[PDB]
Amino acid sequence: EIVTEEQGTVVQQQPAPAPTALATLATASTGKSVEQEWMTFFSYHTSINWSTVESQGKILYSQALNPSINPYLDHIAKLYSTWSGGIDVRFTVSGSGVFGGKLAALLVPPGVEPIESVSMLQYPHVLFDARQTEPVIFTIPDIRKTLFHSMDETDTTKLVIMVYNELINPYENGVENKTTCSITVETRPSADFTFALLKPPGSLIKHGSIPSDLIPRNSAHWMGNRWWSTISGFSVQPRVFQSNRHFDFDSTTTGWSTPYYVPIEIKIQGKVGSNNKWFHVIDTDKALVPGIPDGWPDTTIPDETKATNGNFSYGESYRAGSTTIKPNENSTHFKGTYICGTLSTVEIPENDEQQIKTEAEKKSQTMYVVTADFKDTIVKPQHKISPQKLVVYFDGPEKDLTMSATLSPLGYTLVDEQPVGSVSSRVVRIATLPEAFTQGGNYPIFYVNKIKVGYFDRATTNCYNSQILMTSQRLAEGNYNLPPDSLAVYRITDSSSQWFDIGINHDGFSYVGLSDLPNDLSFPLTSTFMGVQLARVKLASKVK
Amino acid sequence: TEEQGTVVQQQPAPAPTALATLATASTGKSVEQEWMTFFSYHTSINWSTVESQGKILYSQALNPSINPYLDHIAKLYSTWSGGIDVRFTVSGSGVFGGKLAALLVPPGVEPIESVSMLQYPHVLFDARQTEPVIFTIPDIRKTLFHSMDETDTTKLVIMVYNELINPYENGVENKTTCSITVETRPSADFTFALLKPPGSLIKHGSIPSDLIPRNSAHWMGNRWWSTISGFSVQPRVFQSNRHFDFDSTTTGWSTPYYVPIEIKIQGKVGSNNKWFHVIDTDKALVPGIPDGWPDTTIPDETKATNGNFSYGESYRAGSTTIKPNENSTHFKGTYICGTLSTVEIPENDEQQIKTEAEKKSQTMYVVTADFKDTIVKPQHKISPQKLVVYFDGPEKDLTMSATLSPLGYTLVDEQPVGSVSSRVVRIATLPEAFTQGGNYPIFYVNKIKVGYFDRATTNCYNSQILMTSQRLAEGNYNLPPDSLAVYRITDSSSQWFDIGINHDGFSYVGLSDLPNDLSFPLTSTFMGVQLARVKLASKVK
Amino acid sequence: SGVFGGKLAALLVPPGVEPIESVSMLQYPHVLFDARQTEPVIFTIPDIRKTLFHSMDETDTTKLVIMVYNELINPYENGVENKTTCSITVETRPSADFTFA
Amino acid sequence: EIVTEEQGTVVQQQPAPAPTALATLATASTGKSVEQEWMTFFSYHTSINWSTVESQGKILYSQALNPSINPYLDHIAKLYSTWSGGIDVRFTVSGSGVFGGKLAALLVPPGVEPIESVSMLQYPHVLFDARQTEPVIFTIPDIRKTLFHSMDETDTTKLVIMVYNELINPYENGVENKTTCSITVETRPSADFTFALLKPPGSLIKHGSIPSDLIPRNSAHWMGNRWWSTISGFSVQPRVFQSNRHFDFDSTTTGWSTPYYVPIEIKIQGKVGSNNKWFHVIDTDKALVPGIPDGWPDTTIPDETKATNGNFSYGESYRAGSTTIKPNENSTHFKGTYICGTLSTVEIPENDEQQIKTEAEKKSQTMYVVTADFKDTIVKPQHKISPQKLVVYFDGPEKDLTMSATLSPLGYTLVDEQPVGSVSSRVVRIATLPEAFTQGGNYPIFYVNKIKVGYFDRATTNCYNSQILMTSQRLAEGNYNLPPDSLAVYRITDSSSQWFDIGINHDGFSYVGLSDLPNDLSFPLTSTFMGVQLARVKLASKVK
C-alpha cells in the first residue's frame, strides 16, 4: 500500500522516559521561548568607510533586500526555494566628536536604479549625524509584484546610504588622506519575513544563483588563472582579453584547460636524421580538448628564430638596476617560453635496438615549453593553439625515439619589460578571443601575478590574469546568472582605508570605475559582495 | 527593559499584512519548521542472506546529525535536547523469511556484535514488512541539556535476529538481498537551545564527522599527491611528516598541502661528485627544513659518484622476481623534482660563472642523508644539515637557488614507498599505530611515478588521506583517546567495511586483510564514534 | 508480480528549483508506493505560482518527480545478466481548477 | 508483523500441574515474604574502635554514599548502569555506663574533601554520647548536580564521624592504660534508592569502572612486577620509577612485555673469528614490541667491561660474615646480567661443512641475558633498549651457527648491596621512564621482592617492583576510571594490629602516608578497598 510522509507504525520500547518532563527541564535551564531566535536581535552585517573626500550625493552603500543581508537568513535560506517579507536595519556611525557631517538613508522601491545625486534626497529619508551616538532603526519593506520571491530574484526594495553633508574635520594635517570613520549596518529579520517552499537538497535555481561568491573574501586566497601565483596587483587597460582559463558566466570556456593547475603530460618526438633542439609533441594523455594538453601555456614567442642551440644571454641593459631596457640585447633563442621542471623516460624498443637504452638511462632535464609553428629550420610564433603547434625546447635525444614526460610550469623565459600576456597578438587565441573594452565610465582590468624569470637571480616579472582562479572555478562549476545589461559588483578594501568597486560582467571580465588604479596600497585586501548593478552606472571607488 | 537604538518612521512602510496573506495563500505555509512534519532520507541498508544472526546492520546514537535539516540547523546552535524518530521501511519479497531486532542502548554503554545484546528488551520486525516501522529514540541524559560536543547518547541498534531466507534461491553459492531505507524526523520534544556566536569553537571539540571525504575521488595521500587507489592492512603503521593528530600537533616539517620547494644550493671548486648541500630555504614550517621535503631516505651507503639510471634484466616486465643487486643506480630512493634554477653572479670581479648561470635548468633528485664528501650515508633523522640534492650541478665555487616540485621517485625495488620504519624520515619521534584487539591499522595506497622505466609507477603508502590531515590540522576536533572516529566505506558493489580513526590520526579496520577486487569508485559516510575496544564492522567477500 | 518487492517515491518540487538526480532528493517530504501496488494512484500537481495567472509561454511551474526509493526485487532473479522489469503507465486528466483564460 | 518484547502466543502443555499448589508449598517451607529482602535489614559495614587516646578532632569514620557500601546493592548494581537515592547507616555503640565522651556526626556536601581538624566542628553537627544505647541511624542523602548517577561516579555526599569530646574512664590509671569501646557500622538501602537503566549483557562500559580490585585480598597473592617472587617488603622512596611491566590507568605501557611471566624465545648468532662469550640476539617469536622479546629483563650492567671469558668471583668480603662490600672485590665479568636456564638447539645446513652437528649434540647451557652495548671488544651499559642491544653471555659456539633458544629468568648475577632497579640510571628505559614523585604528604613506594643470586649458596638479594603483578594485569586488561587529581586507596592490615593506607595514582604508582614504613611486619597481610581520595590528602596509618 501507499505510504505518506509521516506514515508508519510506531513501536514502543522498554528503556523509555517521559519525553515531556525532560523537555521542560531543558527549556527551564535553556530559557527557550521562540523557535527562530535570530529574529529577535540585530546581527552585524557589514561596514562601509566614510571619508572627508566624498561629497554631498555620493552613495556609500547600495544593497538590495535579500535574505543574504542577514547571516542567519542567508544560512536557513539554503533550505528553501522561496522567500518573502521585509528586514529590519540598525545602522550607526562611529565617528569622533570632532567630526561633522550628516548621512541620509533611504529605501528605494524595486524597478528603480539609484543615482549619486542630491536630488535623491527629495524623497523620504533617515538622517544620521556623524556626531550621533544613538543608533537609528528602521525597516526595509518588501515591495513586490509577485506573490512571493523565488531565490533568484534580485529586483527588490533597495537600501541606499547616501552622503547628505560632506564629512568634515577641523584638522588638515593629513597628506595622502584627511580622515575617515566607520558605518556599521546590522540586520534583523522582520516580523513578516518568512521562508516558503522547501527545496530538495542539492537542487539548482531555475534561473541561476546570485553571483555573490565569485571573488574570495581574503586576497590571500587570490590566485590568477594565467599563473598559479598569488594576486599582488591590478592593471587597468582600455581593453582586456584572454582565452585560456577564462570562463563565461555560463560555465563556458573558449580555452582548452580547466580552472585548476594540474601537471602536464606529453610525448615528444625524437629526431634521427637531424640535429635539432626543438621537438614536436605527438599527443597528450589528460586533456579537455582532444589534442591540446590541459594547462599548456597561454603565450607564444615574440619573433621568428632559427632552431639553433643556445643558452641564456642578456646584455648589460638587463643587468641589475632600473635603467631603460633594450629588446635587441636579448640573444636568448628560446625566449618567451615556459620553464617546466620535468620527469621524463624513454621507451626501449624490442630487437631493432640501436642505442636508445643509453638515452633512456639519462637524467631528466627541464623543458622550455611554448606554442608556435615549426618547420625544418625555423620556429615561427603561432597564436592559434593546435595539437600540432606544441613545441618543446631542451637538450633532448638525437636518435629516433619516443620520450614521455610529465612536466609542471614554474617560470617564464624573460623577453622584455612588458608583463606576460600584455600583447593581444601574443595571446594564444584558440579560435575566438574573449575581450572587454572600456564601457561608459568603467574600465576592464587584469589581475597581476608574478612569474619567476629564468636567467636572472631570485627575480620575477609581472603577469596579467583575466580572472581570479576561484572566480573561474565558481563560474565554471556553479550555476550563476546575471540580468541582461548588469554585473556582479564587489567592494575591495585594503589594509589602509581605500576601496573600490569591481564589477564582474557576464563575459567574465572585471571592471572598475577608474582610468588608473594605485599600487601603493597595503595588500592584505578583503572583498565583500555588494550586489548586482546596471552596467551603465560607473562603479564607486575611493583611492589615490 | 530598553532596546538599544531608536525606531524612526520611514515612508515606504511594510504596513501591509495582506502581502503576507497572499504569500501564504500561494505557498501554502502552515508550520514554521517543516522538517518536523515528514521523514527524510538518512541512510540505506542492504540486508543480505549471508549476514548471519548477531550481526549489527545499523547502530546510530541520538544526535542532530542523524537528520539532514536538524544537522544543518545545529550549526547555528550550541545546545540540543530531545529525541528523534527513526523510520525503517523494509522492502523485500513477500516470499522471503527473517526477523530483525531493534533495541535501545542506554548512554555509557557500547554495543557489540553479539546475541548477548538480545538478553535485553527488544522488538523485532519481519523481512516481509507491509507498513514502515518507526522507532523513536528517547533522549536519556543526566544533564538538563546537551552540548554540541556531546556524543554519549541513547543508541539505536538493529541486529539480525533470524537470518534472511529466500526459498526460490538456488542452493549454489549465491545470495539475494532485501533493501531497507532509514529515514528520520525530529520528535516533538526535540529542540535547539542557545545560539552559538558564529566562528566560535566548541570548548570540548567538534565531532569528527568529516575527516574522510564522501567520494574516494577526492582522496589524495598525505605522502604523495596522487589520489588513493587501494589500501593495505599492516600489523603496524607509521609516519611523521604531514601527519596530524586530533590535538592538531605534528611531528613533521610540512603543512597539510603540496607546495613548491624553494631551496638554496652551493657548489665548491674541485668536486668529482654530484651530490650537494642545502644551505637555506624560503617558505618553511620547522625552522631550517623546507616545507614538503620528502619523507623517505636512501636505502644503503654508496660513493658520491656521478651516474645515471641502470637496472639489470631482473626489472623487465614479466619476471615475478626482482633481485635488488641488479639495481646499480646510485641515487636510489630519491625523489624526482622538476626544477627552475638560477645562479647569483657575484659582484663585478670575475664573471667566470656567468657561463654556469646561463646554462639550462636540470631536474634535481632529492633525498635526505649525512654528507661526508666521499660517501653518502642514509639518515632517518632529518635536520637542516642532512638535506641533500643530486644532479649535474656546477663544479665551480657558487651559490645557486632553485624551485622544485616532486613528480616521481627513483625506483629501488618492488616494496612500496615508506613501508619500513628505518627508511622513514623523522625529527624527534615517529608516530605509530599497532594492531589492537582485532582492529588492524591501515595504509592508504596510491601510485607514484618512477625512475627510468616507461610510464611505469610503484606503490606508495600514506598514513592519512590528505584531507584528514587538513581537517585535523586546521580544525578543533575531539574524541576520547579510547575511541575511534568511525566511517563506513562502500565500494561500487555490495561490499563495505568500516574505518576507525585513532586519536593519534591512524586508521584501523576490523579485518586482518582487505580485498583487492574492490570496485574503487568509493563512497564514505560517517557512522559515529566507537570504543576502540570494539571490532570495526565490515561485510566483504 | 505479487512476488516482487520494491518501492517508488513521489516528490513535488516547487517552481524555480531544478531537481537533481540523487538520493539526497529523498531528504524532502515524499510519498511511497510499492511494486505490488494494484489500484492506480493519482497525484495532483498543484499550480504553485508567484503570478496571478500563467502566460502560454511560461514553463517554470511545479514539478512532479517519481524516483526509485527501494530497488526492484524478484526472488527468481538469477543474477545481474538476468534483468527483470515491470511497467508503469502514466496518464493525465485536467484538474477541477484548471482554466484557460 | 512486529513482535514486541513480551509478544507471543502461550500454548498449554499436556503434562503440567497447578502452579498455585507447588507455589505455596515453597512459600511455606521457605518463609518467602518480600522481594528485595536486603531492604529490610542492616548489613555489616565496618567497625570503629574509640579509645581514650584519640583526641578531639580525630576522624573515626568517613564514608561516601555509594551502592558499593552494601554487599547486596553492590551485587545488583552490576546489572544496571544508573543509580540514585540514599543509604541509611546504623551506628551501634557499646561502652560502659561509667564512661564519658561524645562523637560528632557531619554530613559533608559533594565536591568538597573534608580535612581532619577541629575546625570541622564549625559546621552543623549531631552528637551522640559514649553511653548511648539504642543504635542511631543517619541517612546519607543523595545530594547531586545531575539527574542521576553513573556507575563510575564517586563524588557524592559524605558522612563523617569525629571525636567531639575525648573518651573518658574514671578508672583510667594513666596514659599507658588505654581504654576503648566499639562501634559497629551497618548499612541499609534507603527508601529512595534506585538502580536505573539495565545494560545489555555483553556491552562495554564507555567510562571505566571504579578501581576496587587493583590490589588482591591476601598478600599471599602479591607477586612482583619486575620479578615473579612473592612480595615480602616495601620501600618508601622520594621517587619511584619503572617502565617494563608497569601499566597505566589508561591501560597503556611504555614497556616491551605483557603483564605476565612467560618464557623467552630468542635466537643467537655465532660466526667464526667473532666473540666466543658475549653474543648478539637476532629475531624472536613471542614479542609485544616488534623487536624486543616479551619478558626481557629491564636492567643493564653497572660499569663497562671487555668481552672476556670469566666466571663467578666475589672477594672474601661477602658471605662469610656481616662485613660491607667493595665494588672492586666482585670481579664477575658478567655481573648484573639475569641468570636464566634454557633449551638450546642449533640449525644444520644441507651441507654441514664445519663441525656444526657436533654442537647440536651438546647439552644446553644456562645463559646470562642482559641489555647493553656491544662492539665485540667492550660491553657498555645502555639503558635505552632496542632490538639491537639484546645480548646474552655464556660458553656458546664458534663456527657459523644459528642457534635458537628458549630462556626462563631464574636468578640474577649479584653486584652491590643495593636492590635491583633501585637506580634510575640502570633501569632500562626505551623512550620515556614513568615515575612518581612525593606529593606533599604521600611518598611513592616500591614493592620489594626477593630475587636469587648466583654463587652464594642459596642466598638472594632484594628486588624492587613498581606494582603488584595483579595490579598490572588488571590495569592492563581492564578499564578503570580514576580522576588524575585522585588515587585509589587501599587499607593494608598487618597480621598483628598494624596498618597503613596505600593509594594508587592515575599513572600506576602506589603511595603511602609515611616517609618510611617499619621493617617488622608479620607479612601475611590483607587488603581492603577504601575508595577514592584526593592526592593532596595525607593517607591514613596506625603504625609504630
Swiss-Prot record, chains A, D:
It comes from the Viruses. Signal peptide: none annotated. It is found in: Virion; Host cytoplasm. This is Mature capsid protein. It comes from San Miguel sea lion virus serotype 4 (SMSV-4). The lineage of its organism: Viruses, Riboviria, Orthornavirae, Pisuviricota, Pisoniviricetes.
Swiss-Prot record, chain B:
It is found in: Virion; Host cytoplasm. It comes from the Viruses. This is Mature capsid protein. It comes from San Miguel sea lion virus serotype 4 (SMSV-4). The chain holds residues 163 to 696 of 703 of the full protein.
